[PDB]
Amino acid sequence: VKELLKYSNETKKRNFLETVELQVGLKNYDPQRDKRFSGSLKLPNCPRPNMSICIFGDAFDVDRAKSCGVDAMSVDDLKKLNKNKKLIKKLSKKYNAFIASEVLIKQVPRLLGPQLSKAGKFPTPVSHNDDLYGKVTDVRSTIKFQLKKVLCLAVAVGNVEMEEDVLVNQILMSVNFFVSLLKKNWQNVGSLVVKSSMGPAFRL
Amino acid sequence: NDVDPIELVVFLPALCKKMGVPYAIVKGKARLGTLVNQKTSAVAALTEVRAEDEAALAKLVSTIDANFADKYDEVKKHWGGGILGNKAQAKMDKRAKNSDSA
Amino acid sequence: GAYKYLEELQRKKQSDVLRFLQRVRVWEYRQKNVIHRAARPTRPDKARRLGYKAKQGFVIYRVRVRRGNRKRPVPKGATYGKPTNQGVNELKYQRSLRATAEERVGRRAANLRVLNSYWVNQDSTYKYFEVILVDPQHKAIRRDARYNWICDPVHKHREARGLTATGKKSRGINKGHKFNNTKAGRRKTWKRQNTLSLWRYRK
Amino acid sequence: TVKTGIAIGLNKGKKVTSMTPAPKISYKKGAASNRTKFVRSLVREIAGLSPYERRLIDLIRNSGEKRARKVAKKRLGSFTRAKAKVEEMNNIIAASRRH
RNA sequence: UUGACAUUGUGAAGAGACAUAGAGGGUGUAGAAUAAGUGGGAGCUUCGGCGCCAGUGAAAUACCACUACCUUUAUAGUUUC
RNA sequence: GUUCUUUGUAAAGUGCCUUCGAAGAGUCGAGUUGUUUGGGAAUGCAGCUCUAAGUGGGUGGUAAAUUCCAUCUAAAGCUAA
RNA sequence: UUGACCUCAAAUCAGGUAGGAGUACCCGCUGAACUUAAGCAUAUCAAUAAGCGGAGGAAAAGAAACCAACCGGGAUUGCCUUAGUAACGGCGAGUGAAGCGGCAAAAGCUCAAAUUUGAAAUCUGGUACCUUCGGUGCCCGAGUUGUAAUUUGGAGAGGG
């Protein structure tokens, strides 16, 4: 059972020597090969926030640019379409809408190679705003596979309670055993080590 | 270390290193039988003891396990046998003798 | 409870220690008589569980037997029948090697009432077994409310008939819808349904 | 068992009064027991592994279990045996090699 | 008569996978500069070395976990010829 | 029917609480060879190699994989009419 | 060097037990031919005669790793039925069950697997005496690589 060691409990809230917030990363080991069809490319919805300083550039209009400045990082418009087309890019991802289909051609020339644009297979265009801002500042994080049998990403912070982290890795461990094919090998849940940035890594 | 059926004795030393009691292999199952008014026994247990020899008993326990209990996990990766006879020792060792250091 | 350890021990035959002793024993018997009695069972576990009490009236007999098949006794492969019934090599037998060794020890030990044996050795040209017979004339056993049936004339040559477990396995007198091939006497059940039973009153 | 009271059905039969007596041991002839537990583990450590048992863990760790159940059905008989048999294999793979 | 498997074992060497801890290396033009390479990152840190916001490029560096390919680079154990 | 000796600090069984309850392996089963059979992807039997397990296991008459239900107690012997 | 152990012998030592017959009938292994197919090779006759091994008064078989799929029954034999049917088969000539049901018949159990362990209490034989299908005292040996008692799953044992 998960509640003795850390993983997302307590333990590593004293082994730290850093004063600034450190984002932990969950390291897995799911037995898979060079195939594409057999694997997970899904995203586990985390209920609690990661408090990540990953600024955004979401350009909206009408009843979509009101609940913008309350849960995220920055507030844009359809005219502020001549700010991120020049010499400044620090953002990690963007977000548009349906009313923003006409004004979606002046933002694709700077986001193709890196991929921070609004697409057909990329989470960005949605009409009802106030709902997806609890999944952007909370960091939903995407899961992908390079070529073999392992997976790493970003979970939460090491300064939150023991029960504010146990409900975040409950539906993140369930997505790494459900979306993953049985077209795999022995146990999809084996080694399970976890480190932040410097400290140690505990397994269960 | 006798008994034709050696399979009747190869499980005793393992059950001993699992409980924590002293064991000692003697070289005579026929002798283990005459001190018990029999022919052969091979098996000799010591359960109830008197307040006479209890002292000379803990000293012996130490010498015994000193040789068997501890080197148990040791010779568990060591193979016995493979000793050649006179004809094969000399001819074959005087072969690896006069091909290197002659 | 040494018997429990010895029993799961005789099931780890694919281990390094078991391959050792069955390779040591098998050979020493190959330099002895083919038909040579044994003063002590090499398997206390198997011996006793079948039926073995240490005393004057229980003899063990070490038996080394050959294998292969049974070539028909025809001069140069010369048969004189129909193509179907005209082979010599894929010629088996209707009895097991266990039952065969008993037949030969009952001819040497004609005075003992054979009981049951077991599997011990086997390499390539020879298979090994060791059977146990009883004393139908010894006083200590002639009595005893366990073996008073040994002195009854109805057991003389149990292997020539098949009153043994290996004989009742090779015969097939067990319970089953598949065992209804000869559930009750080979040619007995045969002659039975293959006979015309008519009464004074034909209905 | 509570049927349907008619000819056929998902419970094809009559609804008569139930009785149910005491339990039987003619159902536990293959039980756990503290006696057989002690005995069977003790002998697995004394003899070691067989030739294919070495190459069994080697074809799991290195390749797969779809591969172990594939060659275990060739070494034995059933897929049902491969189930509990190859299941028991990884019981020692984990509870020993790492933990 | 010929192939295979059992019988049928206990070693050395030459290629030979692989547990496991370290060490290690690869795009041209260019940006001081070693690029298939993602994110955490304004600090790990008395030293201040890199920073960094900046910036040239297709990809931006330490606290570096490692999604890591890969090293016939070697070790501590099993392998087919 | 009569009649000798009390067999005895002799054993078995009934009601209640708790812990246990050990039960047969080169056997089972598989591929295959032949042969038998009402038996039909295989009824049995012997041979060959392989080679089990314990909330197990055999059987449920179309194999097979998948999730269940049922039903017995093998690989020990004896017993009249 | 004396004394045990295991193992293999020895005799006109002591005590025993095996053989062939008979073979109507029952248990096995091996095993045909004719015959049919209007021919004839798988098929059939036949899972037959002979042949060789083996006992009894009967024997063999037997208390399920049984049959079912029932409102489940419940060892073994046997007659009636199933039926000339399910089935098999150059789907040819042909061959070929079983469950259930009725009834005569009707007996149940015991060994290993448990620490008798505050006691190998058990058994062979020699000998003495006797009430002799045998008993009791002694002297040896088997046997601890395990003889009495408890217990066989339907239970059951230890503690109380």
mmCIF file of C-alpha atoms in Angstrom, chain A:
data_model
loop_
_atom_site.group_PDB
_atom_site.id
_atom_site.type_symbol
_atom_site.label_atom_id
_atom_site.label_comp_id
_atom_site.label_asym_id
_atom_site.label_seq_id
_atom_site.Cartn_x
_atom_site.Cartn_y
_atom_site.Cartn_z
ATOM 1 C CA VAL A 1 0.000 0.000 0.000
ATOM 2 C CA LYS A 2 1.043 3.594 -0.738
ATOM 3 C CA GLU A 3 1.327 5.656 2.483
ATOM 4 C CA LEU A 4 4.539 4.524 4.293
ATOM 5 C CA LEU A 5 7.161 6.177 2.085
ATOM 6 C CA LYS A 6 6.658 9.374 0.099
ATOM 7 C CA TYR A 7 5.798 8.903 -3.605
ATOM 8 C CA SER A 8 3.419 11.831 -2.961
ATOM 9 C CA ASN A 9 2.996 11.751 0.843
ATOM 10 C CA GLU A 10 5.442 13.393 3.297
ATOM 11 C CA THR A 11 8.980 11.923 3.730
ATOM 12 C CA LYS A 12 10.684 14.194 1.157
ATOM 13 C CA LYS A 13 9.616 17.474 2.851
ATOM 14 C CA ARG A 14 12.741 17.570 5.057
ATOM 15 C CA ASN A 15 15.320 15.795 2.849
ATOM 16 C CA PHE A 16 15.253 19.003 0.790
ATOM 17 C CA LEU A 17 17.999 21.627 0.915
ATOM 18 C CA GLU A 18 16.277 24.012 -1.534
ATOM 19 C CA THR A 19 14.153 27.053 -0.631
ATOM 20 C CA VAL A 20 12.385 27.426 -4.021
ATOM 21 C CA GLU A 21 9.606 25.025 -5.147
ATOM 22 C CA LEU A 22 10.854 21.795 -6.807
ATOM 23 C CA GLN A 23 8.596 19.864 -9.244
ATOM 24 C CA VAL A 24 8.766 16.054 -8.753
ATOM 25 C CA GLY A 25 8.840 13.525 -11.605
ATOM 26 C CA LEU A 26 7.366 9.999 -11.621
ATOM 27 C CA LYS A 27 9.693 7.361 -13.183
ATOM 28 C CA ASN A 28 8.049 4.120 -14.403
ATOM 29 C CA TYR A 29 9.065 0.873 -16.127
ATOM 30 C CA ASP A 30 6.367 -0.650 -18.393
ATOM 31 C CA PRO A 31 7.673 -3.586 -20.590
ATOM 32 C CA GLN A 32 7.146 -2.655 -24.293
ATOM 33 C CA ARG A 33 8.908 -2.816 -27.702
ATOM 34 C CA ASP A 34 9.537 -0.911 -30.976
ATOM 35 C CA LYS A 35 5.850 -1.021 -31.953
ATOM 36 C CA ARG A 36 3.565 2.003 -32.166
ATOM 37 C CA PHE A 37 0.027 0.508 -31.841
ATOM 38 C CA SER A 38 0.887 -1.117 -28.477
ATOM 39 C CA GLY A 39 1.220 1.612 -25.845
ATOM 40 C CA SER A 40 -0.201 4.625 -24.001
ATOM 41 C CA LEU A 41 -0.520 8.118 -25.537
ATOM 42 C CA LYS A 42 -3.269 9.272 -23.123
ATOM 43 C CA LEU A 43 -3.289 11.981 -20.411
ATOM 44 C CA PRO A 44 -4.264 11.309 -16.721
ATOM 45 C CA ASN A 45 -6.419 14.170 -15.354
ATOM 46 C CA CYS A 46 -4.836 15.442 -12.108
ATOM 47 C CA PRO A 47 -7.452 16.872 -9.655
ATOM 48 C CA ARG A 48 -5.031 19.019 -7.611
ATOM 49 C CA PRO A 49 -2.651 21.824 -8.841
ATOM 50 C CA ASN A 50 1.105 21.588 -9.637
ATOM 51 C CA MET A 51 1.613 25.367 -9.095
ATOM 52 C CA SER A 52 3.814 25.502 -12.193
ATOM 53 C CA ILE A 53 5.156 28.820 -13.484
ATOM 54 C CA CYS A 54 4.511 27.910 -17.132
ATOM 55 C CA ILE A 55 3.128 31.175 -18.589
ATOM 56 C CA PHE A 56 0.548 31.154 -21.418
ATOM 57 C CA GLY A 57 -0.692 33.178 -24.391
ATOM 58 C CA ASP A 58 -4.468 32.598 -24.641
ATOM 59 C CA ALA A 59 -6.202 35.042 -27.063
ATOM 60 C CA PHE A 60 -10.012 35.284 -26.579
ATOM 61 C CA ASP A 61 -13.024 37.559 -27.206
ATOM 62 C CA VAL A 62 -16.642 38.075 -25.972
ATOM 63 C CA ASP A 63 -17.752 35.917 -23.001
ATOM 64 C CA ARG A 64 -14.411 34.090 -23.200
ATOM 65 C CA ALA A 65 -12.025 36.905 -22.116
ATOM 66 C CA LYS A 66 -13.666 37.454 -18.684
ATOM 67 C CA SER A 67 -12.951 34.262 -16.661
ATOM 68 C CA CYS A 68 -9.471 34.361 -18.216
ATOM 69 C CA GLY A 69 -7.793 36.596 -15.624
ATOM 70 C CA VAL A 70 -8.620 34.711 -12.394
ATOM 71 C CA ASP A 71 -7.059 31.205 -12.560
ATOM 72 C CA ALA A 72 -4.191 31.414 -15.122
ATOM 73 C CA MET A 73 -1.072 33.499 -15.938
ATOM 74 C CA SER A 74 -1.751 36.076 -18.705
ATOM 75 C CA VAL A 75 -4.636 37.824 -20.543
ATOM 76 C CA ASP A 76 -4.650 38.328 -24.365
ATOM 77 C CA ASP A 77 -7.020 39.292 -27.250
ATOM 78 C CA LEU A 78 -7.502 38.777 -31.026
ATOM 79 C CA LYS A 79 -5.575 41.998 -31.756
ATOM 80 C CA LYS A 80 -2.647 40.930 -29.543
ATOM 81 C CA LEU A 81 -1.878 38.760 -32.579
ATOM 82 C CA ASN A 82 1.147 40.943 -33.385
ATOM 83 C CA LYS A 83 3.136 40.310 -30.165
ATOM 84 C CA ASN A 84 4.108 36.601 -30.534
ATOM 85 C CA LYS A 85 5.081 36.748 -34.249
ATOM 86 C CA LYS A 86 8.463 38.486 -33.788
ATOM 87 C CA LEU A 87 11.411 37.907 -31.356
ATOM 88 C CA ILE A 88 10.017 36.630 -27.977
ATOM 89 C CA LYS A 89 9.048 33.007 -27.105
ATOM 90 C CA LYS A 90 9.224 31.674 -23.501
ATOM 91 C CA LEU A 91 5.762 30.060 -23.449
ATOM 92 C CA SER A 92 5.217 26.281 -23.159
ATOM 93 C CA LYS A 93 1.730 26.053 -24.704
ATOM 94 C CA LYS A 94 -1.173 28.147 -25.962
ATOM 95 C CA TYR A 95 -4.984 27.983 -26.042
ATOM 96 C CA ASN A 96 -7.704 29.218 -28.444
ATOM 97 C CA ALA A 97 -11.398 28.668 -29.223
ATOM 98 C CA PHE A 98 -14.119 28.343 -31.903
ATOM 99 C CA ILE A 99 -14.653 32.083 -32.260
ATOM 100 C CA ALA A 100 -10.886 32.016 -32.881
ATOM 101 C CA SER A 101 -10.918 29.985 -36.157
ATOM 102 C CA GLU A 102 -10.839 33.081 -38.402
ATOM 103 C CA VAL A 103 -7.940 34.466 -36.332
ATOM 104 C CA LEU A 104 -5.896 31.192 -36.264
ATOM 105 C CA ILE A 105 -3.600 31.747 -39.295
ATOM 106 C CA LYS A 106 -1.430 34.540 -37.759
ATOM 107 C CA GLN A 107 -0.294 32.187 -34.932
ATOM 108 C CA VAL A 108 0.774 28.995 -36.786
ATOM 109 C CA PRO A 109 4.078 30.302 -38.359
ATOM 110 C CA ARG A 110 5.881 30.463 -34.954
ATOM 111 C CA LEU A 111 4.482 27.177 -33.582
ATOM 112 C CA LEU A 112 5.073 24.290 -36.036
ATOM 113 C CA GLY A 113 8.512 22.795 -35.362
ATOM 114 C CA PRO A 114 8.131 23.147 -31.508
ATOM 115 C CA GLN A 115 4.331 22.640 -31.510
ATOM 116 C CA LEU A 116 2.545 25.171 -29.234
ATOM 117 C CA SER A 117 -0.332 25.764 -31.699
ATOM 118 C CA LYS A 118 -4.088 24.909 -31.807
ATOM 119 C CA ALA A 119 -4.745 21.672 -33.751
ATOM 120 C CA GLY A 120 -7.082 18.794 -34.554
ATOM 121 C CA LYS A 121 -5.161 16.345 -32.349
ATOM 122 C CA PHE A 122 -3.894 18.933 -29.807
ATOM 123 C CA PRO A 123 -5.945 20.248 -26.780
ATOM 124 C CA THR A 124 -6.566 24.000 -27.348
ATOM 125 C CA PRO A 125 -9.854 25.051 -29.084
ATOM 126 C CA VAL A 126 -12.844 25.224 -26.654
ATOM 127 C CA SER A 127 -15.805 27.666 -26.299
ATOM 128 C CA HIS A 128 -16.568 27.453 -22.542
ATOM 129 C CA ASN A 129 -13.428 28.934 -20.900
ATOM 130 C CA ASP A 130 -13.792 28.911 -17.060
ATOM 131 C CA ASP A 131 -13.668 25.066 -17.114
ATOM 132 C CA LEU A 132 -10.286 24.247 -18.776
ATOM 133 C CA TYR A 133 -8.233 26.688 -16.664
ATOM 134 C CA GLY A 134 -8.280 24.163 -13.842
ATOM 135 C CA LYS A 135 -6.442 21.811 -16.217
ATOM 136 C CA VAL A 136 -3.846 24.284 -17.589
ATOM 137 C CA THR A 137 -2.372 25.910 -14.442
ATOM 138 C CA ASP A 138 -2.768 22.528 -12.724
ATOM 139 C CA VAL A 139 -0.748 21.034 -15.603
ATOM 140 C CA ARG A 140 -2.545 18.069 -17.183
ATOM 141 C CA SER A 141 0.759 16.934 -18.770
ATOM 142 C CA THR A 142 0.931 14.648 -21.848
ATOM 143 C CA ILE A 143 2.236 11.063 -22.099
ATOM 144 C CA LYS A 144 4.204 9.874 -25.163
ATOM 145 C CA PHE A 145 6.703 7.139 -26.134
ATOM 146 C CA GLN A 146 10.144 7.647 -27.734
ATOM 147 C CA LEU A 147 10.882 4.038 -28.825
ATOM 148 C CA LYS A 148 10.982 1.415 -26.009
ATOM 149 C CA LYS A 149 9.623 0.515 -22.512
ATOM 150 C CA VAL A 150 9.645 3.408 -19.924
ATOM 151 C CA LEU A 151 7.716 6.636 -19.047
ATOM 152 C CA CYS A 152 8.483 9.896 -17.158
ATOM 153 C CA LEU A 153 6.574 13.217 -16.635
ATOM 154 C CA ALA A 154 5.509 15.853 -13.986
ATOM 155 C CA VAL A 155 3.200 15.324 -10.913
ATOM 156 C CA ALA A 156 2.924 17.924 -8.086
ATOM 157 C CA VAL A 157 4.901 19.947 -5.486
ATOM 158 C CA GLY A 158 6.796 18.798 -2.386
ATOM 159 C CA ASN A 159 5.231 21.458 -0.107
ATOM 160 C CA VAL A 160 1.575 20.328 -0.157
ATOM 161 C CA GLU A 161 -0.141 18.010 2.392
ATOM 162 C CA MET A 162 -0.058 14.193 2.412
ATOM 163 C CA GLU A 163 -3.689 13.904 1.232
ATOM 164 C CA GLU A 164 -3.406 16.680 -1.362
ATOM 165 C CA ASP A 165 -0.936 14.507 -3.318
ATOM 166 C CA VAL A 166 -2.516 11.027 -2.768
ATOM 167 C CA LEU A 167 -5.594 11.913 -4.883
ATOM 168 C CA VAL A 168 -3.324 13.188 -7.722
ATOM 169 C CA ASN A 169 -1.385 9.915 -8.259
ATOM 170 C CA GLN A 170 -4.545 7.775 -7.886
ATOM 171 C CA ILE A 171 -5.845 8.539 -11.413
ATOM 172 C CA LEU A 172 -2.322 8.919 -12.862
ATOM 173 C CA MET A 173 -1.354 5.333 -11.919
ATOM 174 C CA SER A 174 -4.750 4.094 -13.176
ATOM 175 C CA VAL A 175 -4.120 5.623 -16.636
ATOM 176 C CA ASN A 176 -0.716 3.880 -16.808
ATOM 177 C CA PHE A 177 -2.323 0.449 -16.465
ATOM 178 C CA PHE A 178 -5.585 0.978 -18.400
ATOM 179 C CA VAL A 179 -4.597 2.821 -21.623
ATOM 180 C CA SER A 180 -1.504 0.591 -21.812
ATOM 181 C CA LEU A 181 -2.105 -2.489 -23.984
ATOM 182 C CA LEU A 182 -1.996 -6.111 -22.791
ATOM 183 C CA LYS A 183 -0.010 -6.394 -26.030
ATOM 184 C CA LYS A 184 2.804 -5.913 -23.521
ATOM 185 C CA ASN A 185 4.725 -8.243 -21.177
ATOM 186 C CA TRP A 186 4.993 -9.309 -17.503
ATOM 187 C CA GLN A 187 3.309 -6.777 -15.150
ATOM 188 C CA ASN A 188 2.640 -3.205 -16.271
ATOM 189 C CA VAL A 189 3.197 -2.143 -12.602
ATOM 190 C CA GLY A 190 6.731 -3.131 -11.557
ATOM 191 C CA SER A 191 9.511 -0.729 -10.586
ATOM 192 C CA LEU A 192 8.128 2.580 -9.245
ATOM 193 C CA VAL A 193 10.859 5.061 -8.158
ATOM 194 C CA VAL A 194 10.314 8.865 -7.610
ATOM 195 C CA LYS A 195 12.747 11.854 -7.410
ATOM 196 C CA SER A 196 12.270 15.670 -7.507
ATOM 197 C CA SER A 197 15.479 17.354 -8.768
ATOM 198 C CA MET A 198 18.258 16.484 -6.297
ATOM 199 C CA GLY A 199 16.918 14.366 -3.428
ATOM 200 C CA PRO A 200 16.602 10.523 -3.348
ATOM 201 C CA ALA A 201 13.968 8.298 -5.036
ATOM 202 C CA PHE A 202 11.682 5.889 -3.103
ATOM 203 C CA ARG A 203 10.117 2.707 -4.548
ATOM 204 C CA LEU A 204 7.101 0.599 -3.424
#
